[PDB]
Ligand binder design. Structure first.
Ligand SMILES: Nc1ncnc2c1ncn2[C@@H]1O[C@H](COP(=O)(O)OP(=O)(O)OP(=O)(O)O)[C@@H](O)[C@H]1O
Ligand SMILES: Nc1ncnc2c1ncn2[C@@H]1O[C@H](COP(=O)(O)OP(=O)(O)OP(=O)(O)O)[C@@H](O)[C@H]1O
Ligand SMILES: [Zn+2]
Ligand SMILES: [Zn+2]
Lengths: 184, 458, 145, 96
């Protein structure tokens, strides 16, 4: 708190920033528990107040129900709220929310099958796709490839893409079969 | 030989990539032609036949040729998609994984929550030696090593990234000469990375548009067997026409609201059916002839199905369908039942659906207007108001089209990427370092050249 | 030309009432309401004609005997034996009918395809009768706005 | 009307600080100034946590500022809340 106050009040003191980098770790650890607000001070000046944020209060505040309450309060104070009692309503909401978080903390005491199937299929089908290259079954098309010509090459890669597409058809059929197996 | 056939293959693949969109529209044209020729389809006469009435006498060969052409065009569109759109999707996912690895360490300091199939599948690609295949930065495997080498161990990061740090020492040392040529089929097979291709095939199969195109293929193939499966190809107008896409986005914008409204309508009518089942049973007699009693509400399920199918579709309501209540003990209760049914189910709920649709139109129009006037009043990068620039005539347009053009920023990014790192200037190196560390502070925010040098320029 | 032809046939003079659109600017606002989204309305009508064609195809494939419109059982009059006749019937009858095609064609009770027929009718009513007309009216209202 | 009310709330929050009431542009003259002001300087969560801290803390160990704010909270005088002015406005030329 002392170091943060000094750093904020003097923003451009080189010795201050150096001593701050010497003091990085403690500041980083205490940043979540450190809060700062600006109040209308007695000296007719705006002053900053540094205080302790408790872990329980922060968790209860971050709980979703309190977030919904905050959204509802903001909507209400914006739509049917006036500047005369806007901040009064804010204080009332703050008090009610503090009471409910104190009650909640007090009362509080202390697909994988589908992923496996879809990954096994995506492995096995591609293994079968590359299995003919693994066996070196392209030696049959080798003798025909020896006749280099445009029509032979176009039919050859059309046959290759046809093999890819029939492998895709086997994949989608196996997906449907597995879906039916899960159903039954 | 290899160097000519591979070149011609690349030419053909490039042709398909170039003509992907044109063939996509022409497939729709062929679909409209086949559906138009199917408009004359007729049932011939148990024995059930199906023969077209051919006034010209050549309609049957005509749509046979049309179906074969449509199927071939589907194959060409499948090829063109893999030519053009697949590299972009692969680049996107590959760069996203690279960034998550270098900056978030999703495989060293974090592990996928096992509900993200994308991450579970992308765990495979890191081990491959063909990574940054599409992403320009081939240096991610070294960035990760430098960033996280000590805390997890050079050996562990090298094993996770599948890099041969042991061979790096031998490479820097004296490495023996070996014969090597790409003419060998075994050599080209070793050059092909089986696991990276496996990952790429998985990503492509996961891709939604590829699934849509495969469904188009399957429907065309089944349409060859049964000619009426070709009608499903008319469902492609939603994506072909963006003008129709606005109309469809009108109803899909509030699709959840519409589905919930239908569920609420089904629940309210179920409550009404329960009330009728409890009290108004003899009123639901639908027997045209008094001799044969046909009761539609003896059973809960039958009564509910009748309420849906008849009352929900009927304009007047369930009262205009079921029997008249005159001269009965439950006359007033029946009348109140009918009036409440008509007001709630027939009027309000349909009004709710139509109002949701209209509100969706209005919200889309307001969003477009918001984007329009936001662009016309604020500079995209500066964030400065238009009036300050407009103090000089045409100042806002000059600032937005000459000084801070997003096209100019994009071209600068391209220039940095294309340019060699050695010839980077001072500014180029400075911006390149912040781009590589993903620090966007170099972008002007709230200030510009005119603001900084106002009184000197003016 | 219309006046000259109206001399020959006196009923050609009715087309001169189409001049109110330009004579009255107050009517011109009302007409500009629908012509502002004229392209959207035409595309909506085309989409309605395509969806009903898909429904007609489904009926032609499965629900054929249901489309029997014979008042007397002696004379069979089938409205969906032919693709074109079935589509024209779907348009002229179902699109104009408030309840849908189900309130027009025969009842499904005691049949194998009962549930499929019911789902067909419900989907037809929700999409064609309700949503598409709602789309058109919403386009018109959005044009006013 | 419901949609317009939601949009009104949204852009009101995104253009005006909840407690300060100051426009977003003045803070945005420094990059990310509005978000910094709304999330670090004048966070309503921070104000609520300060109220909790005052309530939980014993009255004897109240500091000067804590006692001052506690007295105005107990008399229900909300003048201590910043209205129209902030730290940046008060110390503009010293900070900048
Ligand atoms: N960085 C920017 N580059 C260009 N225009 C910008 C930029 N920032 C804001 N604008 C606004 O956008 C207008 C033109 O750019 P915009 O892309 O919105 O127009 P367009 O009509 O879509 O252009 P085009 O004719 O290229 O399709 C400018 O006059 C300005 O009001
Ligand atoms: N005192 C304030 N505290 C926080 N945000 C404020 C405040 N005053 C105005 N805002 C506006 O609200 C924005 C974020 O706060 P807000 O509660 O509206 O967001 P949210 O999306 O509901 O947040 P969350 O993720 O906590 O649910 C800020 O960026 C700012 O525009
Ligand atoms: Zn700019
Ligand atoms: Zn503030």
């Amino acid at each position: 708190v002392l170091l943060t106050n000094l750093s904020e009040h003097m923003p451009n003191d080189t010795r201050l920033q150096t001593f701050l980098e010497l003091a990085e770790s403690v500041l980083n650890y205490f940043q979540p528990f450190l809060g700062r607000i600006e109040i209308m001070g007695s000296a007719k000046r705006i002053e900053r107040v540094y205080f302790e944020i408790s872990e329980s209060s922060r968790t209860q505040w971050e709980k979703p129900q309190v977030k919904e309450s905050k959204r509802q309060f903001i909507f209400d104070v914006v739509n049917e709220g006036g500047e005369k009692e806007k901040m009064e309503l804010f204080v009332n909401f703050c008090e009610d929310t503090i009471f409910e978080m104190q009650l909640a903390a007090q009362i509080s005491e202390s697909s994988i099958l589908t992923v496996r199937s879809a990954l096994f299929a995506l492995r096995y089908n591609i293994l079968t796709l590359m299995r003919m290259l693994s066996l070196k079954s392209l030696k049959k098309q080798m003798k025909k490839v020896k006749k280099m010509t445009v029509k032979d090459m176009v039919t050859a890669f059309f046959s290759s893409y046809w093999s890819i597409f029939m492998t895709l058809l086997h994949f989608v059929a196996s997906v449907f079969r597995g879906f039916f197996r899960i159903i039954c | 030989f290899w160097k000519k056939i591979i070149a011609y293959q690349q030419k053909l693949l490039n042709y398909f990539a170039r003509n992907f969109y044109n063939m996509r529209m022409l497939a729709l044209f062929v679909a409209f032609a086949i559906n138009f020729i199917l408009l004359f389809y007729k049932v011939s006469t148990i024995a059930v036949h199906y023969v077209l009435e051919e006034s010209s006498g050549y309609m049957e060969p005509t749509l046979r040729i049309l179906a074969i052409l449509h199927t071939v065009i589907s194959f060409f569109c499948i090829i063109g998609y893999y030519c053009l759109k697949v590299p972009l999707v692969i680049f996107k996912r590959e760069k996203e994984v690279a960034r998550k690895l270098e900056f978030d360490g999703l495989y060293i300091t974090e592990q996928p929550s096992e509900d993200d199939i994308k991450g579970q599948w992308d765990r495979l690609v890191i081990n491959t030696q063909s990574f940054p295949n599409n992403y320009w930065d081939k240096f991610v495997k070294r960035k990760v090593m430098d960033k996280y080498g000590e805390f997890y161990g050079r050996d562990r990061i090298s094993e996770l990234l599948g890099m041969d740090k042991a061979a790096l020492d031998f490479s820097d040392a004296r490495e023996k000469k070996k014969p090597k040529k790409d003419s060998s089929l075994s050599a080209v097979l070793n050059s092909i990375d089986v696991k990276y291709q496996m990952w790429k095939l998985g990503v492509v199969f996961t891709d939604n548009s590829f699934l849509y195109l495969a469904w188009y293929m399957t429907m065309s193939v089944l349409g060859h067997y049964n000619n009426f499966f070709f009608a499903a190809h008319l469902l492609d107008i939603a994506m072909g026409f963006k003008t129709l896409r606005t109309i469809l986005s009108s109803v899909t914008h509030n699709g959840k609201q519409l589905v919930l409204t239908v569920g609420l309508l089904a629940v309210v009518v179920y409550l009404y059916t329960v009330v009728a089942f409890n009290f108004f049973r003899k009123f639901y007699n639908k027997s045209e002839d008094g001799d044969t009693p046909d009761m539609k509400c003896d059973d809960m399920l039958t009564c509910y199905m009748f309420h849906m199918y008849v009352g929900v579709r009927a304009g007047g309501g369930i009262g205009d369908e079921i029997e008249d209540p005159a001269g009965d003990e439950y006359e007033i209760y029946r009348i109140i039942f009918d009036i409440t049914f008509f007001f709630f189910v027939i009027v309000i709920l349909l009004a709710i659906i139509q109002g949701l649709i209209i509100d969706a139109f209005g919200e889309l129009r307001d969003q477009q207007e918001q984007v329009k006037e936001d662009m016309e009043t604020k500079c995209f990068i500066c964030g400065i108001g238009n009036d300050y620039f407009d103090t000089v005539p045409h100042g806002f347009e000059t600032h937005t089209l000459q000084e801070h053009n997003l096209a100019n920023y994009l071209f600068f990014l391209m220039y940095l990427i294309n340019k060699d790192e050695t010839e980077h200037t001072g500014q180029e190196s400075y911006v390149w370092k912040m781009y590589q560390e993903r620090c966007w502070e170099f972008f002007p925010a709230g200030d510009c050249f005119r603001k900084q040098y106002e009184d000197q320029l003016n």
